[PDB]
Amino acid sequence: NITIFTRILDGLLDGYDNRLRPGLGERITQVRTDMYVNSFGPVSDTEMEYTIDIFFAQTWKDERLRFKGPMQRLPLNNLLASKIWTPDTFFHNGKKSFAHWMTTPNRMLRIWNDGRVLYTLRLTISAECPMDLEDFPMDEQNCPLKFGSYAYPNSEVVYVWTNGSTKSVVVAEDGSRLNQYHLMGQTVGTENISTSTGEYTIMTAHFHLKRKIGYFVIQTYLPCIMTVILSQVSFWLNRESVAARTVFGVTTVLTMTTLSISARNSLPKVAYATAMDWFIAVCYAFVFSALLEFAFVNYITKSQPARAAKIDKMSRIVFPILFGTFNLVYWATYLN
Amino acid sequence: NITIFTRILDGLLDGYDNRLRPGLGERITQVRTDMYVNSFGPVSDTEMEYTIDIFFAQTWKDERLRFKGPMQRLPLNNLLASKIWTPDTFFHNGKKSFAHWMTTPNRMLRIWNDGRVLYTLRLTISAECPMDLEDFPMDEQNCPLKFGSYAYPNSEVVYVWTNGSTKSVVVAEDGSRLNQYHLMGQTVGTENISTSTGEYTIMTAHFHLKRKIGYFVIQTYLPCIMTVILSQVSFWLNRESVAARTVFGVTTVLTMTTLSISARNSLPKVAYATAMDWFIAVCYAFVFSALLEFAFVNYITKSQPARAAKIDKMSRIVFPILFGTFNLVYWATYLN
Amino acid sequence: NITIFTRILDGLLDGYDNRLRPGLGERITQVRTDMYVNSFGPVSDTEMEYTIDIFFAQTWKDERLRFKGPMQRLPLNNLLASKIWTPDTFFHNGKKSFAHWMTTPNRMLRIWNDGRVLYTLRLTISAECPMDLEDFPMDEQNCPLKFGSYAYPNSEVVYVWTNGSTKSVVVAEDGSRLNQYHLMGQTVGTENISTSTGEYTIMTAHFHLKRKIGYFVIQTYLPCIMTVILSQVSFWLNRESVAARTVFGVTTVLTMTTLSISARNSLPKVAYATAMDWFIAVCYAFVFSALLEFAFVNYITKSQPARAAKIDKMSRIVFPILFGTFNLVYWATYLN
Amino acid sequence: NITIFTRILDGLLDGYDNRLRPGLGERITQVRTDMYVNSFGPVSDTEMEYTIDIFFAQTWKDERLRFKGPMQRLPLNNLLASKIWTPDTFFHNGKKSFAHWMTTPNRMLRIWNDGRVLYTLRLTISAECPMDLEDFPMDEQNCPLKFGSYAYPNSEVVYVWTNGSTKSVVVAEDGSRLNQYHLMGQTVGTENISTSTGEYTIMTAHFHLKRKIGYFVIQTYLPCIMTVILSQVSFWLNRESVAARTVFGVTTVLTMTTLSISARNSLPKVAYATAMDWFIAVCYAFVFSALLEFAFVNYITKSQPARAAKIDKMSRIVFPILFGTFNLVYWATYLN
Amino acid sequence: NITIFTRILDGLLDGYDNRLRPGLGERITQVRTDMYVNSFGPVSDTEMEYTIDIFFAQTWKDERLRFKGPMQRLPLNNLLASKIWTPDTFFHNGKKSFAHWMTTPNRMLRIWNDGRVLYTLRLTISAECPMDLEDFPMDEQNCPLKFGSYAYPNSEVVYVWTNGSTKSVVVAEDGSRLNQYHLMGQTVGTENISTSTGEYTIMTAHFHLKRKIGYFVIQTYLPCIMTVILSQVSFWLNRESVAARTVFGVTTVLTMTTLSISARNSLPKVAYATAMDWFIAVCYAFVFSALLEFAFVNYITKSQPARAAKIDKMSRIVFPILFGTFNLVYWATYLN
Ligand SMILES: CCOC(=O)c1ncn2c1CN(C)C(=O)c1cc(N=[N+]=[N-])ccc1-2
Ligand SMILES: CCOC(=O)c1ncn2c1CN(C)C(=O)c1cc(N=[N+]=[N-])ccc1-2
Ligand SMILES: CCOC(=O)c1ncn2c1CN(C)C(=O)c1cc(N=[N+]=[N-])ccc1-2
Ligand SMILES: CCOC(=O)c1ncn2c1CN(C)C(=O)c1cc(N=[N+]=[N-])ccc1-2
Ligand SMILES: CCOC(=O)c1ncn2c1CN(C)C(=O)c1cc(N=[N+]=[N-])ccc1-2
Ligand SMILES: *[C@@H]1O[C@H](CO)[C@@H](O)[C@H](O)[C@H]1NC(C)=O
Ligand SMILES: *[C@@H]1O[C@H](CO)[C@@H](O)[C@H](O)[C@H]1NC(C)=O
Ligand SMILES: *[C@@H]1O[C@H](CO)[C@@H](O)[C@H](O)[C@H]1NC(C)=O
Ligand SMILES: *[C@@H]1O[C@H](CO)[C@@H](O)[C@H](O)[C@H]1NC(C)=O
Ligand SMILES: *[C@@H]1O[C@H](CO)[C@@H](O)[C@H](O)[C@H]1NC(C)=O
């Protein structure tokens, strides 16, 4: 009962040319594609790339593979994949993509009586995701995934998503786990690109990313906020304690200087100011301004002591108010 | 006496199709799997992955390989593995798995008279282990290992553990050696997952990990604890020594600030607070509060000196007590 | 209607030797090359290399592939590429180049009736780009890309750009995105190099890079500029406050020392001074000079107090003026 | 005179099955193994692995390769290695081993008239070397190297070292060069391991490593030793100089805190205390104790000045003596 | 006119055994080798290795390839390389060598009428270069490059440089570009090594490297030199300013401590003192000695004030002189 299957496979491969697409010179080969994202790998902001592991499935019609037998389907493995024609699908934005080979090349091939072919493959794509880090860390990113035929233009091979967008792309519940991003959702679309080699239909999948704040709050904002509060303590010390207040201003100013350097070490070396940079810059101004207030106060503490005391007393109220007011504007401006 | 073995191998391969599973169209192929963990590689918390080296063994029945001869078994090597049918087993959560090829592809194939086939393979699997670092470093992790057929659904190929759970998975005594984890034990199970390509039986092995503390005690807790004690020394200095006590508060506050930054550099950039973060935050409050006490004491040291001395004297007792009390609650809360 | 294509391919490969170039012993094989830069990868200054992803296309004439049929063109894939002769093009300056294999080897082959052959390939070239970092960060770089035949000298195979320079090399709008460089434009050229193995025509493409400033302003210049301003605040403090002014000078001098070390950590370990180094050196002189002024002032504050006050008062004006004057000369000198 | 060699090779391969070991069903195949360590690569303490490059040679007897000819030996290359049977030797503890392929696969095959076969191979083995870092840096390590057959149990293939232990394993004079280890010597042995797949003879080579001190002396011990001496200088300052002595204690205590953090960055994250950790801990106690002495002295400098001076004077002698005494015990305890 | 070439290639391969070296059993195969260094890659001091990209050319005589035809030479590509015999040349000290495969395997094969064969190959060799860093950074290194036959002893295959040493090895003008080394020149030689597998002729090429100073001057020496000068400023302050002079000594001593740690981070972890270490150690003594002078001066400032002033005044002259004198001896000793 098993020899029958062997004959069917031999018959289909008899006189079959894998170098020619099905329907050549007769029609346009239509390929239906569906994707299942097993795991949405890490998003490297420094390299502007993200890693994704998917089960890429392609379906098409091949009349040369029609057969008759007791079983309506022929489950198979990677062995027969090379013997038949498969689309030369490639990822336009994929910088480096490699397949999984252990324990066996993770490929499946299924053939029906009518000649319909299902060919799914497991891939780990490392694509490029350009980002505009102007609102960082309150930034949203849209990482795309573009793929299509490499050699067959739109007039020969056409890719279309199967069913609706929701069914076309599926993300596992545990797969969408990132340390500094929320996977809000996914969208799909199609487009035609005109090239010197001809028109090619492009299948694009966009992943919406919402950066999750809380790591930078514990890493950058809080040390900056507490450092500013530390500087304001100097206003509560006597003017004659010149050395004591000097330590506050000098240490706080340098503390903010190193925080700015440390903060940008993890951030990509982008040549523009981000939202976090402005927050640090303002905090640096507050600590620096406090030192200037002491220097000005200590400069006139002898000629006009009366005004020096008033400035020091007033600074105890103005500085906390302005810093608190700035945060409300800053957080409300970006958290909206 | 050696030519007989050659004839047997030629006969079995004569008319044998490796593209068809044994028992096709007649029964369901049953595969018995056993695992031996040679070494439980490092667990990368930053990348949420772990590396494991195993001797993956699969056993199944193939009537096409039945033979008669003086020897009841036919030990072999990787040469004949490709000539026969083998299950397309793959690791669902395996991000990157590679085989060992030196000196020779580490594969063994054994065939008995009845047709039973033993096919073991050495692998180095780099799987993903999601972790909830809310109780870090007093956290327990359960890293799984899922594998199954890629192309053959549950109706064609079924995986079952051999004998009990203990015999199914074995870990070498020297293999289970990690720098920051204890391998408490292992558990195995089976489940069926419904997919668009059909139902597939999933074989899962869970490794229980108990993070071992002591590195963070020497790295984070002790510097934080001693820094807090250092700040409390300021309470034993005279109020008029404004500069001396200012150095204590400023240096200690900044010392805790850098410790928080340094501590999280090794920790994954998770957007939530861990148990260690709370300990650092409380320690930061103690050192910061001590500086505020001096500022308040130095602010009223002239108008009401009597109360200033009492506060300074009282702080010498309250601060050590509260810090010690906090540790007992903190350690008892998590070490239980 | 599909069997006709199979016969044509069989006929062309019948009696075809892929080890012999077309026109051997009769003429010189002319290859027309065009390039499309999908993405201009990162430029590693430390390793003096850059990564580029391109669609490398080669066109040549092969009379052995002439055919007659209803279709004037024969779109194909990588399968037939190995069966025919292709140029042994290689990148002379390419340190490490790898092809893309997923989902299918990204190669296309097209053949016309006259025998013209189009063979395009996707590549990721990691070439070496020597740089003279004397005006860093106000430096312009010209990273080349040289390629040609490895085995066929100029007398056998010749490479020529197709159409003009603009059409020969094309860069995608989104591809030319670098964190610290502007892709001003591209230029192409040809040359002959004499070697022991014969003369070889070299096709060269030069990419003009204009480093974008703004990251170093936020990372190096601003901390240095503010540190210098911080030191000058000491001039506004009383001479008798010896400890207070000592903290300013010591902290600022050490702050500049660490900034110089930190700044060069990212910069390649070049054994010469850059423009940024001179800026840091001058800033170090200003902060160091301020401390010397205090030491000199504090040294004569008793013998001749009158001159000490004048020097301190005068320094409040001279130092800000010189530092501001230096910046105008420095920025104007390099920003021109 | 060269055609004779061609006939001999053809005759031996005629009717030769490479899937069957020599002497199958007649005797036990004996393999003689010798090793030459070209270079003992770096030992990664963090990853508990070491890299070694060797010339692995295996010798065995194969009666199927007997031949008669003018030349008693048949030097060859990797071409014939795949055509005959070779042992499936593998490294049990080898985490990742790769062969050398340039310029040609570095394999040699030699055959004698009697059928003796010599098959040597060049390998770069990255094995795992567990270490107990309790006496670090005064620790000795014994990195093993285990290898044997993967598919042939002890009843079919047996490995034995050739000649004595000294000749069996040889290390090049320049190969044994490590930055932080001394290669004292090598030892070899054999053992049988019982496994579910049968008994396998294991050939083990142990490399004795003696960590060389001097890098940690310049990196950790000396800064710690000088820091302690720096703290003791405070005892020679007047009590009334409260700020001056406070700077000594605060700076020294924090200096030791960062040294402990910095020292363990290179060290593996082991969850136990090493010898260096105890040395740092004691040094931290000395600097911390000195600050406590000043605080206690400054606390009673008014009520009982007489005792305060005596304590300060006495501390100038006790502290240097105890620190010196501790070092003699510490160094003698571990350097013995 | 092209079919003639096809017949010649078929005739040569007819009855040709690639497993036998030319002249086997009749003479000794002589191989002439020439090298062209396209680029001398980076020299990794930490890993004691260097990377080099070369065009490795080998020439030998093979009477089996003699042919008669209109063309005196047969330019070819990698296709025919595997069909004929080529030497099994390998690099003895090569830790990891890989070939270039894009766009086509960069191999050339040329055959003349007499049977002379030219076979050149492009390689990227990562060899090991042991270094004695005793005079670092004033150290000279001699990185070798050893290669020879793997399977054919000196009695079968012999390697000889072609023409003189200068022509045998050539380095491109732009190839010899290193960030911290000068390529003074190259030398070549030959030697015979006796091994258990027989005598093998070794072809060695030595590259003379002269480390270029200037990065460490800007990174290590200058901060150390200026730090020492900073400490000497304390001698110009009044003795009663105890806190002011304490800050100078404490900050400078700790500044030198961190510089020593930072400097050795890039340097390999060698267990011996380098020239830079001695310079840092002396600088540490000067800053430390200055603090001791203040402590001694402040200790006797009351009992014998007259001597205290003289010591402080004298130290202003002695310390600068000794430090300047040391540099002249240090620089002259190593820069000679
Ligand atoms: C420079 C001459 O062209 C080429 O060498 C070439 N080679 C491939 N391709 C091209 C053309 N091009 C720039 C492509 O972006 C390209 C896009 C496609 N669509 N998809 N998915 C499919 C193929 C494409
Ligand atoms: C998107 C269409 O599907 C695919 O392309 C596909 N390709 C493989 N597989 C699938 C289906 N799927 C999502 C799988 O998770 C899958 C699980 C399995 N069980 N195991 N072990 C076995 C195979 C599976
Ligand atoms: C040392 C003997 O030569 C060789 O072994 C060798 N092998 C290849 N090549 C050479 C010669 N040479 C130094 C090359 O730079 C070279 C340049 C070329 N042009 N392109 N593009 C093409 C080929 C070249
Ligand atoms: C889980 C069922 O077993 C296996 O799958 C398997 N596969 C290989 N091997 C084994 C058995 N085992 C645990 C091995 O440690 C093993 C050791 C050997 N000796 N050597 N050198 C040789 C082979 C071995
Ligand atoms: C342990 C038994 O030997 C071997 O297994 C072996 N295998 C190769 N080789 C050897 C011998 N040996 C130690 C080599 O250093 C060796 C050097 C050579 N010359 N070159 N270039 C050529 C070959 C060499
Ligand atoms: C692409 O081309 C096809 C040609 O049939 C057309 O139907 C389709 O609408 C085009 N898509 C877009 C986005 O223009
Ligand atoms: C999976 O399916 C099989 C079908 O025979 C069933 O026997 C088994 O109980 C199922 N397993 C689970 C966990 O439901
Ligand atoms: C290279 O050689 C060819 C030989 O025909 C010549 O036409 C061309 O001008 C040469 N190119 C250069 C740059 O000299
Ligand atoms: C291993 O088994 C063989 C069986 O012949 C025996 O001779 C040998 O002594 C055993 N080795 C050990 C270490 O027990
Ligand atoms: C190596 O051996 C050959 C044998 O002919 C000899 O001619 C040559 O001089 C030897 N080389 C050295 C360096 O001894």
Numbering used by the authors:
A (entry chain E), B (entry chain A), C (entry chain D), D (entry chain B), E (entry chain C): 14 to 322, 393 to 419
Authors' text:
α5 subunit-containing γ-aminobutyric acid type A (GABAA) receptors represent a promising drug target for neurological and neuropsychiatric disorders. γ-Aminobutyric acid type A (GABAA) receptors belong to the pentameric ligand-gated ion channel superfamily (pLGIC), and in response to the neurotransmitter GABA open an intrinsic ion channel that permits the passage of chloride ions and drives inhibitory neurotransmission in the mammalian central nervous system. In contrast, clinical modulators such as benzodiazepines that treat anxiety, muscle spasm, epilepsy and insomnia bind at the extracellular interface between the α-subunit principal face and the γ-subunit complementary face (between α1/2/3/5 and γ2) and do not induce obvious conformational changes to the pocket in structures solved so far. Instead, here we performed rational engineering to generate high-yielding, high-stability, simplified homomeric and heteromeric constructs based around the α5 subunit that could be structurally resolved by X-ray crystallography or cryo-EM.
In the case of RO154513 we included a megabody, MbF3, that binds nanodisc MSP2N2 and has been shown to dissipate preferential particle orientation. This led to a reduction in preferred ‘top views’ by α5V3 and a resolution of 2.54 Å from a 2-h data collection. Neither flumazenil nor RO154513, which is identical except for an azide at one end, interacts strongly with the loop-C T208 side chain methyl that is unique to α5, as revealed by a Thr to α1/2/3/4/6 Ser substitution in α5β3γ2 receptors only reducing affinity 2-fold for flumazenil and 3-fold reduction for RO154513. The potential of this methyl to stabilize binding will be greatest when the distal end of the type II BZD phenyl ring contains a larger functional group to draw closer to I215. This is the case for all three molecules, the RO154513 azide, RO4938581 bromine or L655,708 methoxy group, versus the smaller flumazenil fluorine. Correspondingly, substitution with Val in α5β3γ2 receptors reduces the affinity of RO154513, RO4938581 and L655,708 by 3-fold, 6-fold and 5-fold respectively, whereas flumazenil affinity is not affected, and the reverse mutation in α1 tends to increase affinity instead. Overall, the two extra methyls, one from T208, and one from I215, both contribute to the 12-fold selectivity of RO154513 and the ~30-fold selectivity of RO4938581 and L655,708. As previously observed for other ligands, the binding affinities of RO154513, RO4938581 and L655,708 are two orders of magnitude lower, being reduced by 360-fold, 96-fold and 340-fold, respectively, for α5V3 versus α5β3γ2. This is presumably due to the previously hypothesized requirement to displace α5V3 Y49 to accommodate binding of certain ligand types, which is observed for all three ligands.
